Design a protein around this ligand. Structure first.
Ligand SMILES: [Mg+2]
Ligand SMILES: [Zn+2]
Lengths: 49, 691, 572, 52, 76, 61, 53, 226, 236
């Protein structure tokens, strides 16, 4: 997240969450993990005021 | 028997139940011959609790010993020595199944043994230092009673051992056709079989007691228990097996226990089974039964419940036990003694009166309508209640006994009680849909369907099959011991004989002589880890005897043709049939079905109460709420959370709307939210609702 | 449908029963009807039957994991004291009939009843919400029937014999009825190949072009080369579905049901699965699958394989006594040797067993089980794991048919007990995980139809090398299927293959692959811009309906439950 | 806390003897609609005495 | 299509009902309100189609909806 | 503050809400399933909850 | 061994050198030790123990 | 070819209670179906008579014991359920069994009235010691199939009567087989052999006649279409 | 002794050649007793006439196609199989069919001898092109059930003959379904639903009546043993 950006961190999260399930053949559509991830990036740490 | 020998790690002074470390539950190599690795509870207590071994004894210091045969320079000796784990660790111990000559010499140059790391290795003859006493040494009593255990995985063996302790005794017991050599001792040592204390002759025999005349001019009398209640509700019946003029010997069984026949454990019935799917009624491990098992009471059981009621004083007056009670018809008191208690042998239905007990009420100001009604008719007025003892809603049977304790004769009634009455209600239970049956190999299932005798598949001779088990469950659940059980059961049911013309058959080279020929309806023993190898059983299947018509129904492969009972056409392929020994488990449907419309609630929580009591409501947990939310069922969730649980003002209105057929009113504020608001207000927090 | 005990249904519907009884003059007042019902008077069942009917009841198992664990059914009275459950929904409930128990609830309010029969009705929830694929399909024996029914075997009676010098074609039947008559006569085997005239079944898609270019209609007879069993099977499917002519096993049936759901209404799929259940049970009853000692064959070459491997094992064991290898290195060498032995014995087993053996017939058809269990049962168990996880060097040379020794059985129990004792912890961990996911994502709700944003996300449809061919990617199902295109799909030419805002499905996936394009932009909830919750168009088509999500969907709970569904299946 | 666990309490299984039963609440109303409404309206002033 | 006649509460077919409203939820409230009105009339607009022997109000409401006989306003 | 109290630490959440005089708006269906009010999702949203149905004049006639 | 045992033919191939001991010795012997029954001292003395307690 | 031939039935008594009957020739495919119909009718639709209730002098209910009687009441009921009885009148009939002193009481010690018969006198009922005293009164009724015991209070009976399950069907075993004949066309016609075995209550011939009659009456409904 | 409840029969006229008969309420265990017996009797008791063998002048060996006609030999064989023939007498009669020139040869253009009737004069036999000449002969017999084509390796000396399977039974397709139904007090009675399909020659009701009569006659063979034995009579 800090190096590449916000667009890339979501891809990594989804890929790593999906691969563990996929190893055992459990088919889960990406959008569920997508919804779970969406709520993880609702806030930003403030620096200057 | 297996409760007295249980080992427990929980309780005070041991592993705290809160912690319950996962690491200690697994098998350690020192369990061999000391603690059974197969017998454990299947719940969260897995591993922590296990049964003692068959040959194990406790050293005075509290360390479990086990016997081993001393061995010497290539020769096995007759000195059996008990060893502890530590003292056994110093030596080399060989397996029991290894071969030896007549003198005791090891035939094979290299012998498979155990080693200090708790490991399995091979060593030469000179290295060996001890041997196991018998193959059964590592298994407990219950696990020892499973034939062909070595053909079953540990999981299914554990399940079968656990379930063998749930088998309810039946009206008439039948010993298994095929079983272990242990079934005998497990009964004699259980203490449930009357044994002779001295050699002599039986003098007189009666259903209530037996008498024996010793050989030294002594007379002994044994009383037999009849229809006694057990802690778990079953019937602890006993019955004799001897006849007048019979010369008994010391330690000889005279009477059978609940699950006993001829002094052998009989936990279930052996019946004809065919392995094949059948129209999906046995789908997903369900079971299908012939109506025969219901007609002739093959699996009927007796169950006795014990109801109580105590009459004790109050500050408005004493409580009395009497025949007469207010506000009931005289026909309701048909089988009630003058002293209130029901007659012995009377049949009691649901909600009937067992003991009439009026108690002071003293509430005189009745409503004017009740005043008018009681003035119209002869029931002028009464000042007492009708708090009689009544059969629970779901129980029925016949009264088999009554006991009464009274302070009038200074009985040790706990302080605050004047009288106490106990009534025993016994009932027979035939097998029915929803009952649970299982074999000895962890293949339990519910009864999906009971079918008429004419719908069952039948052998060419015309005998229908009693049970049919699904094929798909056998291989995946991975318990093939049941197939061997079925085949050897068929071999035992119909006698077997092997001809001897060109010597003994090669497959029967090691078969003892007494096994060459046996009559019909014989019984066979297959010791665990020393049972019949599949070659001998295949030969026995191939050398079966014919039926009354001089023919063989089951071929040499253990299969036979079957005729469809519905259509009549023969099945396209042969089906495997035999005799399997099945149990009846105490997890009956007759006492697990319950449901509630509207009735008693809980005081403090204002919620319907649950549990054993009648009208036990169901619990709508949190995951159920999550499922309803995922469905988007907003209205149904509100109905299940307010109207039907804790809306005191809403329950009555909904009930009266249903009775009148009117529209259901919208739910109100539940008691839970009101109580939470009052609590937060009590904490000096001004929780104010806004609109 | 679901079966309810008479006593339970009566006592549970008691209020409605009393209302109707008093309505029909059977009782003069409510209390009289109550007392009459208390003892179950015979003349109340005629009222209960008209009361029970058309009144849905919710059935639920514990523990509940996904929303399909609660489902509405139409009750019907049944003798006994046990609830009869439809065999298809078991997988949805994860219920098995080795003694599970189920709870039943009754909706009272009109709104609750409407919800039960519209939203929660069992026949309207075939598609699994986790992946949008069907969950109520034949399983276990149900497949073994349709398998046996549709299997084609040569060298049977009644085959199709071509014309010869002295005789004309033999196995030709004027209609399926004639084939059925021949089968009853015992002259034609169901699994034997035949040539038959079909007049009510639509021909295959390709065969149609050369026969009825104008268009096939009912009554237009054509000639089919197929077994009678396949003809019987294909009449279960809707008449508009073309002849398939394939040996049905689990994945083929899944393909057929998936295709049916996409192009047909929900009711048709329910009726088709019911017909398939009936046929599968009926034909599995007669498939002849059975277990016996001589039926579980043992590879003859095992005595050769293990004897050969004995030399290698002895070689390693003697090489360790000289201190030329570490203890762990020797253990690894022995483990590799015995792994090779196990693989060899397993492949020898699959070589030896005939095609129609009941064990291999069950395993290969996809009905249940797996080949490793067959290898363990027949060939040998092999290596096992101690409590610490190390591979015990000594293998289990015996098999559960041959008869294990005392010490092999003793050492086998470690891993079995460990795995048996791990399940409770797995369930607890999965429950905690599901609790947390539900907690975090509980305000993700479809609040507005469309947020009107162009910020999508890239996804890949096809895989290819520098030289080779384009093939649908290995994870199209979990990533690309059931999305909405954020931007038009244009190839190297410029023509728009798919316009923006179009739903993405298997027909569209194939069309895009036909266009030779590998990547496309699809809308996402990561980029969704609506202030409150999310919007339907970014979420994509609902997994539980195959259509666009409607406003108010509680997608957060669905996502949490779908992620937590495989709680006890993620074993290392 | 009773039950070998810190989940149940001594008090969960207290059955209320005062809790209103809906059926009776209905029944009385029916009586009020059967006694006062019908049977009273059969003797005019002669029934009027019963009212007081 | 060729689908057989629906049985029990599956009558009428659900897919045909989905054409009459926005989605499942609106259909739930629509049918529930119509059934409530039918109860109001029964216990004192009535059923606008011929009822069954003792057909429940909700079944009659759904049968009316099958023919798009009524109309509703999504009161946003 | 209802859900926060439910999750980890009730005393801290209640104290902070009291000193701040905060108010919980009943949006989000954890709070609604506590109060017992029908959840604001699916059938319970205002878009569908206020649906009014009136029979057509043709059918009435 | 057991006088009244019904004849049950067994497939046993090995011989038993040690009969199965009492199945409830663990409880009864421990209790006898607790109460110090002389019928337990008689057996304890046989183990070469002087003045058992 | 349309042969103008009809099936014929021939009997063969294998024992006093076991009989084999051959029906032939039939058109191909009828043997198994007819055998199934006959078996389904015989096994569960042959009317008979069996005990309905028993009363003993010194027991108020079945979960007790009789002084001086080795067998329990439940064992006595189990033994009685094996009784083979036949009644000539539909109405209930009463039978008595009295025994005093030591000995063995069997089914041959009963004293049935006119119109009632028992065909297994060697059935062992119980044994009595020196002070044994067994008195029993049994009720016999006609019926078919299986009917479970009816509780007293439903029947309005006073305490003491012990209802028992009734086994009315006299058929013990049934089977059938089919062969291919050669009378008209090679292997294209079926010969059906049905074997019946009954308890000594009735001979197989009467049971077969009853099954045929009930089946004929049932198919009369189909015939009635005209 | 009288039955508990008298069964009744109702009819759903599914189609002009199909019908569904519901018999209810049967007592437990009788639905499957009646269903299979009725099905087998219907399929193999009603006699009828059907084509059994044919001969074609245009083809003598090498049964692939007849020159000058569009249809294949097997197609013509199947079309002839799908024919309705009613013969008064049971003699094995011989029939002819000749046509010349382009057009369509249909069942209505065949000349049947005395005592033979064809109920489907609109059944398409084949289509002939220009300069066409189709000559065929066939044999008609009465029979019962479905019989596979009898091999003529002994009578094959008369080369050119084409034996075929015979569908004698007017009933084409029968299937039964035993549903559960409720008597006033009990939920275990049986409703037997039987669907029957018939050729154009007969009607479903007549076929069902004939099957019932055949079954009654067949079981009379056993009923006659002892008419005095008690039976479960439905009554009138
Ligand atoms: Mg289960
Ligand atoms: Zn959006």
């Amino acid at each position: 997240l800090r190096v590449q950006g916000p667009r890339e961190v979501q891809i990594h999260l989804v890929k790593e969450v999906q691969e563990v399930y996929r190893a055992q053949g459990v088919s889960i559509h990406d959008k569920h993990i997508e919804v779970i991830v969406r709520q993880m990036l609702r806030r930003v740490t403030i620096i200057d005021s | 028997l297996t409760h007295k020998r249980r080992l427990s790690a929980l309780g005070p002074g041991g592993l705290s139940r809160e912690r319950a470390g996962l690491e200690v539950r697994d098998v350690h190599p020192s369990h061999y011959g000391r603690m059974c690795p197969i017998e454990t509870p299947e719940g969260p207590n897995i591993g922590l609790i296990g049964s003692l071994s068959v040959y194990a004894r406790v050293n005075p210091f509290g360390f479990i010993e086990t016997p081993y045969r001393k061995v010497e320079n290539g020769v096995v000796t007759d000195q059996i020595d008990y060893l502890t784990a530590d003292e056994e660790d110093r030596h080399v111990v060989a397996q029991a199944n290894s071969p030896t000559d007549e003198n005791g010499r090891f035939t094979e140059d290299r012998v498979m043994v155990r080693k200090k790391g708790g490991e399995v290795e091979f060593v030469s003859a000179d290295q060996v230092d001890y041997m196991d006493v018998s193959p059964r040494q590592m298994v407990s009593v219950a696990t020892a009673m499973i034939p062909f255990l070595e053909h079953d995985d540990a999981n299914r063996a554990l399940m079968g051992a656990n379930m063998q302790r749930q088998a309810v005794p039946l009206v008439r017991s039948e010993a298994p056709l095929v079983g272990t050599g242990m079934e005998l001792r497990a009964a004699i040592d259980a203490g449930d079989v009357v044994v002779a204390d001295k050699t002599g002759v039986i003098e007189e025999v009666s259903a209530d007691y037996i008498t024996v005349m010793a050989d030294d001019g002594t007379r002994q009398s044994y009383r037999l228990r009849k229809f006694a209640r057990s802690n778990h509700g079953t019937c602890a019946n006993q019955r004799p097996i001897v006849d007048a003029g019979q010369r008994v010997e010391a330690g000889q069984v005279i009477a059978d226990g609940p699950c006993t026949q001829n002094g052998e454990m009989a936990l279930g019935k052996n019946l004809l089974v065919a392995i094949m799917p059948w129209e999906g009624h046995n789908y997903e491990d369900a079971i299908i039964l012939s109506n025969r098992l219901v007609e002739e009471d093959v699996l009927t059981s007796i169950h006795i419940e014990e109801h109580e009621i105590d009459a004790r004083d109050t500050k408005l007056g004493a409580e009395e036990i009497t025949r007469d009670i207010p506000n009931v018809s005289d026909e309701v008191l048909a089988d009630l003694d003058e002293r209130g208690i029901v007659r012995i042998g009377a049949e009691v239905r649901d909600g009937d009166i067992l003991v009439g007990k009026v108690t002071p009420k003293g509430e005189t100001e009745l409503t004017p309508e009740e005043r008018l009604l009681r003035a119209i008719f002869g029931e002028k007025a009464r000042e007492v209640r009708d708090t009689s003892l009544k059969v629970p809603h779901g129980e029925s049977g016949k009264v088999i006994g009554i006991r009464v304790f009274s302070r009038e004769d200074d009985d040790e009634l706990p302080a605050g009680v004047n009288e106490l009455v106990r009534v025993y209600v016994a009932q027979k239970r035939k097998i029915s849909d929803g009952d649970k049956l299982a074999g000895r190999h962890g293949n339990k299932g519910v009864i999906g369907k009971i079918l008429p005798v004419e719908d069952m598949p039948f052998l060419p001779d015309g005998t229908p099959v009693d049970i049919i088990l699904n094929t798909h469950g056998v291989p995946r659940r991975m318990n093939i011991g049941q197939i061997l059980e079925t085949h050897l059961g068929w071999v035992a049911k119909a006698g077997w004989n092997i001809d001897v013309a060109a010597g003994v058959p090669d497959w029967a080279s090691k078969l003892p002589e007494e096994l060459y020929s046996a009559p019909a309806d014989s019984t066979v023993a297959t010791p665990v880890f020393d049972g019949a190898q599949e070659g001998e059983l295949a030969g026995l299947l191939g050398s079966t005897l014919p039926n009354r018509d001089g023919e063989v129904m089951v071929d040499a492969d253990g299969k036979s043709t079957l005729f469809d009972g519905r259509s009549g056409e023969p099945f396209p392929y042969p089906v495997t049939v035999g005799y399997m020994y099945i149990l009846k488990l105490h997890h009956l449907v007759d006492d697990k079905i319950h449901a509630r419309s509207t009735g008693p609630y809980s005081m403090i929580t204002q919620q319907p109460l649950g549990g054993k009591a009648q009208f036990g409501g169901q619990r709508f947990g949190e995951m159920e709420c999550w499922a309803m939310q995922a469905y988007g069922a907003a209205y149904t969730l509100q109905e299940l959370l307010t109207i039907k649980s804790d809306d005191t003002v809403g329950r009555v209105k909904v009930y009266e709307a249903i009775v009148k057929g009117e529209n259901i009113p919208e739910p109100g504020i539940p008691e839970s939210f009101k109580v939470l608001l009052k609590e937060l207000q009590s904490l000096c927090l001004n929780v104010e609702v806004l609109s | 449908q679901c079966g309810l005990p008479k006593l339970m249904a009566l006592e549970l519907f008691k209020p409605f029963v009393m209302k109707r009884l008093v309505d029909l003059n059977h009782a003069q007042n409510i209390k009289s009807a109550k007392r009459m019902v208390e003892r179950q008077r015979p003349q109340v069942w005629d009222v209960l039957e008209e009361v029970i009917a058309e009144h849905p009841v919710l059935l639920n198992r514990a523990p509940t994991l996904h929303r399909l664990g609660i489902q509405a059914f139409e009750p019907q009275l049944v003798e006994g004291k046990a609830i009869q459950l439809h065999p298809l929904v078991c997988e949805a409930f994860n219920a098995d009939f080795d003694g599970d128990q189920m709870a039943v609830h009754l909706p009272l309010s009109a709104e609750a009843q409407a919800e039960a029969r519209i939203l929660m009705l069992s026949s309207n929830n075939i598609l699994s919400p986790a992946s949008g694929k069907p969950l109520a399909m034949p399983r276990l024996d149900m497949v073994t029937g349709l398998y046996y029914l549709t299997t084609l075997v040569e060298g049977a009676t009644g085959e199709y014999q071509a014309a010869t010098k002295d005789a004309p074609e033999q196995g030709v039947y004027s209609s399926p009825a004639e084939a059925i008559m021949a089968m009853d006569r015992g002259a034609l085997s169901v699994r034997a190949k035949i040539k038959v005239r079909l007049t009510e079944l639509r021909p295959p898609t390709d065969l149609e072009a050369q026969l009825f270019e104008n268009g096939w209609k009912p009554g237009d007879a054509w000639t089919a080369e197929t077994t009678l069993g396949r003809v019987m099977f294909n009449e279960l499917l809707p008449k508009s579905y073309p002849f398939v002519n394939e040996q049905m096993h689990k994945k083929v049936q899944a393909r057929i049901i998936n295709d049916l759901a996409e192009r047909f209404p929900m009711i048709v799929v329910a009726q088709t699965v019911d017909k398939l259940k009936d046929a599968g049970f009926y034909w599995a009853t007669r498939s002849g699958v059975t277990v016996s000692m001589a039926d579980v064959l043992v590879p003859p070459q095992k005595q050769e394989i293990l004897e050969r491997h004995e030399a290698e094992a002895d070689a390693i064991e003697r090489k360790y006594q000289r201190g030329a290898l570490n203890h762990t290195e020797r253990n690894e060498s022995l483990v590799k040797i015995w792994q090779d032995a196990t693989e060899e014995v397993g492949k020898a087993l699959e070589e030896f067993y005939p095609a129609d053996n009941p064990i291999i017939t069950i395993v290969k058809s996809g009905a249940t089980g797996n080949l490793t269990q067959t290898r363990t049962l027949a060939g040998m168990k092999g290596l096992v794991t101690n409590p610490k996880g190390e591979f015990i060097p000594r293998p289990i040379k015996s098999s559960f048919r041959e008869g294990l020794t005392v010490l092999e059985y003793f050492i086998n129990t470690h891993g079995a007990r460990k795995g048996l004792a791990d399940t409770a912890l797995r369930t607890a961990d999965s429950g905690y995980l599901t609790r947390r996911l539900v907690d975090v994502s509980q305000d993700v709700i479809v609040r507005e139809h469309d947020c009107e944003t162009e910020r999508g996300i890239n996804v890949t449809l096809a895989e290819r090398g520098p030289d080779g061919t384009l093939i649908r990617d290995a994870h199209v199902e979990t990533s690309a299927f059931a999305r909405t295109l954020a931007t038009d799909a244009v190839d190297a030419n410029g023509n728009v293959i798919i316009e923006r805002g179009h739903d993405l499905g298997d027909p569209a996936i194939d069309a895009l692959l036909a266009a030779g394009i590998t990547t496309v932009k699809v809308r996402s909830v990561l980029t969704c811009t609506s202030a409150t919750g999310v919007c339907a168009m970014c979420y994509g088509r609902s997994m539980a309906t195959g259509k666009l999500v409607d406003i108010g969907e509680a997608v957060g709970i669905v996502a949490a439950q779908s992620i937590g569904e495989p709680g006890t299946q993620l074993t290392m | 806390t009773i039950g070998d666990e810190g989940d149940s309490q001594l008090g969960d299984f207290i059955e209320d003897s005062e809790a209103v039963v809906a059926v009776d609440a209905v029944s009385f109303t029916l009586l009020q609609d059967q006694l006062q409404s019908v049977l009273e309206t059969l003797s005019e002033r002669e029934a009027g005495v019963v009212r007081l | 299509s060729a689908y057989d006649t629906p049985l029990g509460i599956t009558n009428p077919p659900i897919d045909e009902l989905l054409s009459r409203a926005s989605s499942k939820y609106a259909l739930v409230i629509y049918a529930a309100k119509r059934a409530r009105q039918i109860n109001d009339y029964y216990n004192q607009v009535g059923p606008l189609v011929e009822p069954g022997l003792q057909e429940k109000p909700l079944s009659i409401a759904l049968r009316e909806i099958h023919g798009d006989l009524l109309e509703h306003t999504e009161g946003e | 503050w209802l859900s926060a109290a439910s999750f980890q630490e009730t005393t801290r959440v209640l104290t902070d809400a009291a000193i701040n005089c905060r108010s919980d708006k009943l949006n989000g269906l954890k709070e609604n399933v506590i109060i017992g009010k029908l959840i604001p999702a699916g059938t319970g949203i205002s878009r569908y909850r206020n649906i009014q149905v009136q029979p057509t004049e043709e059918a009435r006639a | 061994s057991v006088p009244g045992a019904p004849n049950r033919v067994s497939f046993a191939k090995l011989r038993e050198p040690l009969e199965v001991p009492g199945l409830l010795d663990v409880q009864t012997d421990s209790f006898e030790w607790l109460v110090g029954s002389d019928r337990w001292r008689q057996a304890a003395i046989d183990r070469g123990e002087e003045n058992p307690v | 070819m349309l042969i103008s031939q009809r099936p014929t039935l021939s009997e063969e008594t294998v024992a006093e209670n076991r009989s084999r009957f051959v029906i032939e020739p039939l058109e191909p495919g009828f043997g198994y179906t007819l055998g199934n119909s006959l078996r389904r009718t015989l096994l569960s639709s042959i009317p008979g008579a069996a005990v309905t209730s028993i009363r003993i002098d010194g027991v108020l209910h079945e979960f007790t014991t009789v002084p001086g009687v080795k067998e329990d009441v439940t064992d006595i009921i189990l033994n009685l359920k094996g009784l083979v009885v036949s009644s000539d009148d539909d109405e209930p009939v009463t039978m008595y069994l009295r025994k005093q002193g030591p000995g063995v009481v069997t089914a041959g010690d009963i004293v049935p009235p006119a119109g009632v018969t028992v065909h297994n006198p060697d059935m062992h009922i119980a044994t009595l010691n020196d002070k044994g005293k067994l008195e029993v009164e049994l009720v016999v009724e006609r019926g078919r199939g299986y009917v479970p015991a009816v509780q007293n209070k439903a029947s309005g009976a006073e305490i003491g009567r012990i209802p028992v399950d009734s086994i009315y069907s006299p058929v013990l075993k049934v089977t059938y087989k089919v062969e291919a004949t050669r009378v008209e066309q090679r292997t294209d016609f079926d010969k059906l052999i049905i074997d019946v075995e009954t308890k000594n209550s009735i001979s197989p011939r009467d049971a077969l006649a009853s099954a045929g009659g009930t089946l004929v009456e049932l198919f009369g409904l189909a015939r009635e279409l005209n």
